[PDB]
Amino acid sequence: CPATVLRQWCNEFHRWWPPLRVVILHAIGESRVKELIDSVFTRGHVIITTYVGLRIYSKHLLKRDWGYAILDEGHKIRNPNSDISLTCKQLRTPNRVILSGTPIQNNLTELWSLFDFIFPGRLGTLPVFQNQFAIPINVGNLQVQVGYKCAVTLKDLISPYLLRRVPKKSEMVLFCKLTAPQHALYEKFLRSDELSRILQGKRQVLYGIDILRKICNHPDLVDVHAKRRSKKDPTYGSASKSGKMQVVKKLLELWKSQGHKTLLFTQTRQMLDILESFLERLNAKGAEEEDFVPFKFLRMDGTTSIGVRQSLVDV
DNA sequence: GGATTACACCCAAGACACCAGGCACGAGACAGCAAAAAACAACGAAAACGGCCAC
């Protein structure tokens, strides 16, 4: 189980079934873990492990036989060929159960790799799994019917191996335009040597679409002095240059006076600096004048500690 | 019988090819102030964030 539910997983054991003994894979539940191993198979009933902690004591875990196997992680297995398979699929037990309602999110290769852990391959090998129906599903008449049967065969083959069970919502998508300073920086980066250099193969496209998203968030994020002016230059953020501040200012102020607890969502902690300078400036403007209320934001990320979590989640 | 009549035997001029060496090509192989100094372009990038374990 993840490290965010470690105590939780021991808790239901304690409350529902006290007769079941339990031992987490930590300093308690290099010799000390070996005395822990002493009578962890006869006396010990259930062993708990964080899915980072197996490769801390795997020397004396993967060796002996095991019974029932539970893994509460269906998005940290995904596709094959990773440390996942290295420390997981070497377990010695038919009983293999995964607890996750989102196993399929990227591709059917993840499906094959997840089916491998539970069953020894009722479908076939990875080359077999691919050559069977990988391309036909993607491309697809000339595809549908043969593809229809080749897919329903898979559905009947794996269906008795994974269970499936399922106010209102408004999805308004606004299509804003690139500003003129944005279009200039877009064309400048558009016609440059680095893009072709990435395309031919010396680099990866992952570093050329991260920088063209770096300009869409706002112009001032493709600067070389990003860290040098992120939190010590009160002009780094700015407004109306991003092409989205106006549909941010208007949309957030339509709820600020309306009193609607709203969620602002990003992906980068670097753009958090800009949206945080922006909202501090909004706070300054509101506080200087009257008939208003402080914006009162907060930012949470991996920089903070695991202890904080729920607290802010609650506040 | 023995010498004219004929035919064999060889040897000398002859030729073609042989043996080698020249002669020309043929392309490698060069190989081209020294000392001093300054300008002077080009040699030339893994993003970013999280979930951890160990501080």
UniProtKB/TrEMBL annotation:
<protein>
    <submittedName>
        <fullName>DNA repair protein</fullName>
    </submittedName>
</protein>
<feature type="domain" description="Helicase ATP-binding">
    <location>
        <begin position="1"/>
        <end position="121"/>
    </location>
</feature>
<comment type="similarity">
    <text>Belongs to the SNF2/RAD54 helicase family.</text>
</comment>
